[PDB]
């Protein structure tokens, strides 16, 4: 099945709560089927912006693609590292599209043919940095949507962090679960205590809370608090996988997220690395189109490392470009019964 | 494409006194044919043939019956959970089911697992023995279009360096030499046989020390690891984590299908060995075409695979089957058929 056409466009997003932007990918074969994929690139964690991503997604600059066989898409995706080697949201949207494809072609959904380990998992709903009662009753809100995990970004500032991660705990009143996200701003001392708390207060675990170039801070630490941290913006590919799960490992957790890494392919040598290495697999989202995360998706419930996601980048689109791909209910995300990714697009 | 059938036999293979091998095939409901085979090394993984045998039992398949092969992925895990102590058994199965997956969409196996080299030179062995021996056996094997010697050392310095003189000086050039001591060497014998290798262009030394002894390789200089390969240390991807892990062990990852049990965590291996920079090299048993055939589609789909000792089915008086790739001056290549592209 030959690759006939590859089309991009930008896409504004505008949120529910501003606007946000996505390259939108149609691959078509010359059977007709047509692949999707959606692009959100992250300039402060990959270096990506929009505007070379955009270019290398460019129709000519892909014409090394056009007329290739999907059949042989480990090839395909060995070129993509090669030829799009800075550009990862790009490499994904292509990846995933890609992947979509080779599902259809072979009639089922794509967590099927990458090898099913699991049917539903709960995802979290992100709340931001504010105040306490801004927290407090963003959590009720969810908690009213059907939500049981929560993710709660923290500032670094620890007496605020503290309070709110306090206040919330007392009133959840063990209705969800909670994770934390300071995304870099914590120190060293300021860890200690902040993960004394975690302890407190049944918090699953901490993402990310040095620096991204500071893992020899995680190495430091006792491996009982090592293995409640998660990786993020340490962790784009493979190679960092392997760095970060070498003995003495950095952490417990890693969180790919697809734009990170560059597709489902890189996704599979980083769940392959966690999984040797006895490591939980998060699966994190940029803000996103529903067809990305549903590529997250069925990534996630074919990897047996996976334990948990954030797959909450598309609840905040007013608009989207296609349906479907995956279910949401009581809080828990699952695929479509439909080949591929299972988008509904018009 | 669902798993309709699945049959073993034994079979009997004199060489050219005899070796065993177990056949798996595999049928489909829409008539398709995954072929499959086990040659279990007990001394290194453990798994006897009786062993071997009673894990392939067809009526110990039950779960595989009625699966779908599009689902290969899930499949191959539960084959590691279902067979852990018998990866030659497991590695029939999976390239069994491989050879199928890759017969359903129409394509030569390792076109499907993405294609990164056309051929490569295989060794040949010449197993121990006195210098006019080996020097004779060279000749043959030279005058079959052979460019690659790996020659088996015993671990005695002088009969090991005086061999390694000799052939090199017969070769004239002609072929390169590896050479395998098997676990046979201490420490300082490994520093002079490192510097002999060095002196006759040697590729490199697999397995010096005992399996369990990689703290003895982690002990060396770099430059020298990077001239190691890994054999009986190496039998699945727990393994390869630890010998690529820092400081690494070795330059060189030897992956048999027999020690790994399949393609599945051959794969594995080799996502390890890239990341790490770690060259591949696939070795076999004693093996029917099938199974050479399987080890060489993986080989020629990973871009770290630098080598190969892809002989065990050379001397086999018979076999049961053809094709599945193709020999030519001293290269194996594989054919144009989807699947194996095996001729039954
Ligand atoms: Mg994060
Ligand atoms: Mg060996």
Redesign the interface.
């Given at each position: 099945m030959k690759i006939a056409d590859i089309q991009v466009r930008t896409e504004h997003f505008p949120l529910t709560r501003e606007e946000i932007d996505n390259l939108i990918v149609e691959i078509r074969t010359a059977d007709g089927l047509l692949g999707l994929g959606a692009a959100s690139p992250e300039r402060h964690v990959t270096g990506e912006t929009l505007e070379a991503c955009h270019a290398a997604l460019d129709h000519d600059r892909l014409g090394w693609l056009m007329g290739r066989d999907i059949?042989?898409?480990?090839?395909?995706?060995?070129e993509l590292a090669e030829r799009l080697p800075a550009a990862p949201a790009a490499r994904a949207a292509l990846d995933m599209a890609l992947h979509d494809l080779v599902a259809q072609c072979?009639?089922?959904p794509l967590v099927?043919?990458?090898?099913?380990?699991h049917d539903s998992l709960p995802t979290s709903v992100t709340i931001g940095i504010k105040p306490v009662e801004e927290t407090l009753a963003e959590a009720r809100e969810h908690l009213a949507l059907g939500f049981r995990v929560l993710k709660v970004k923290l500032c670094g500032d620890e007496e605020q962090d503290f309070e709110r991660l306090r206040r919330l705990h007392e009133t959840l009143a063990g209705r969800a679960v909670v994770r934390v996200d300071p995304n870099q701003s914590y120190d060293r001392d300021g860890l200690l205590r902040l993960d004394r708390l975690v302890q407190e207060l049944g918090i699953e675990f901490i993402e990310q809370p040095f620096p991204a170039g500071r893992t020899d801070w995680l190495r430091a630490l006792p491996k009982a608090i090592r293995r409640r941290i998660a990786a993020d913006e340490s962790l784009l590919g493979?190679?960092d996988?392997?760095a970060l799960?070498?003995?003495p490992a950095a952490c417990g957790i890693f969180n790919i997220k697809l734009m990170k890494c560059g597709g489902l392919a890189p996704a599979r040598?980083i769940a392959?690395?966690a999984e040797?290495?006895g490591i939980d697999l998060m699966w994190g989202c940029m803000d996103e189109s529903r067809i990305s995360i549903a590529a997250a998706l069925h990534a996630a419930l074919?990897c047996?490392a996976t334990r948990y996601l954030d797959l909450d980048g598309s609840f905040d689109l007013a608009r989207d470009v296609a349906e479907g791909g995956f279910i949401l209910e009581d809080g828990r995300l699952r695929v479509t019964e439909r080949p591929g990714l299972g988008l509904v697009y018009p």
């Open positions: 059949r042989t898409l480990p090839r395909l995706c060995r072979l009639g089922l099927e043919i990458l090898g099913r380990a493979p190679a996988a392997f799960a070498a003995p040598r392959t690395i040797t290495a074919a047996p």
